[PDB]
Amino acid sequence: CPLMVKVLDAVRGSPAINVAVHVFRKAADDTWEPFASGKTSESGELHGLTTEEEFVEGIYKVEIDTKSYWKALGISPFHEHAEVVFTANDSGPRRYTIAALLSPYSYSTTAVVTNP
Amino acid sequence: CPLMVKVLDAVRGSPAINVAVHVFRKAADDTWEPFASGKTSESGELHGLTTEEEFVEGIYKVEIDTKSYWKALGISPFHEHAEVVFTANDSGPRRYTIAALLSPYSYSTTAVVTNP
Amino acid sequence: CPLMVKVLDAVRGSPAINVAVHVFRKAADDTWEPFASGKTSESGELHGLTTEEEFVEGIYKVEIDTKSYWKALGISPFHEHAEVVFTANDSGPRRYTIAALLSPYSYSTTAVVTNP
Amino acid sequence: CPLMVKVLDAVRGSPAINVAVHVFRKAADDTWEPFASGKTSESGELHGLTTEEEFVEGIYKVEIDTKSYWKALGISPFHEHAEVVFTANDSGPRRYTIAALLSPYSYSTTAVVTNP
Prior knowledge:
The structure is a homotetramer. By secondary structure, chain A is mainly beta.
């Protein structure tokens, strides 16, 4: 799994479940092309977005739909989404975990990058 | 000053100085229009971006050029930039501070929304 | 003012007001001696803790009563308090700001160390 | 495993390996009694600290030896350690993950608490 996303809820001390995630890849015309999407599981994790073959070098954007998460719980949060933008695979294939820690008016995001 | 941006460096324990910041407002055609920009000061702060009269309700994006900041320090970073996307809401008087705390492979952002 | 403490609330997007803060200095017998204390202001800040003359090199602990803060808001928290432990080092002129960003089940703390 | 500790390095975008962790439990005389200890693995995780039987209700302190981690890499960091203090098991047995995200002048800590 070369790309995994993990989301935690800092209010509840729990995984953030059923969070929508959209991944985009910058195209030759400098527009964001849809690449993959999915929803976090009961563990707060989203696996199976892509494959080593498909996950070529490029500039990627991981959009985490934080507003929809908080609104579904009755909280009116500050941000629309959390966006994570990065170059991937430019020194060869790596495995990326993009983690996010959510609060209604704050979030954190960390990348853990390993060479398989 | 309804909108201020503050950037901190978690590696050095210091304000993040001379960081480029760009603000965009979403236009009716769903594109991001340049709105304001500047560079953080010696205190890590960027004031003077906008006025009460100009800062109307709408969806804004604050882009913080993190990659350039790390490169100037000789440090290899993960993200292309940090992006903060939010709706400005009139609800009695409100000042917005968008704070960011930067590490090479992680950042946090918090909105501090106050009434003078 | 060589030592300032600043506390932010990531749930409400606000300064954390009226938070008790206690500072201790490690004594020769390896016990924590009360040093300074106070409550954060309407801006989330606590100034006036110490002076240049009193704040000598040594190991300090800043204890932030987070649990009481959450309880006053009717919110159930995880931590008993947040603790920040560090050595103060004379190395030319230095001011220390200990910042904390609070959520019920998570906190961050950052040291911003500057020269006037 | 009712208590697990996970540490990440925000500079490198990697698990924090070989980080020493000491756990204490508050005793009847209000002193911190040693409870368990260990070092993070190559995954940044520390498993096997305790058992359901031994991990009774109480106030626990998890001390993460962050200074020794950074110094072993040639970085002179700000904090002595990161301390996480919390009541555990007071509504019955839970599983606790204490995560920490480290930078030289900043850290974050989150608890994920699940009911088995």
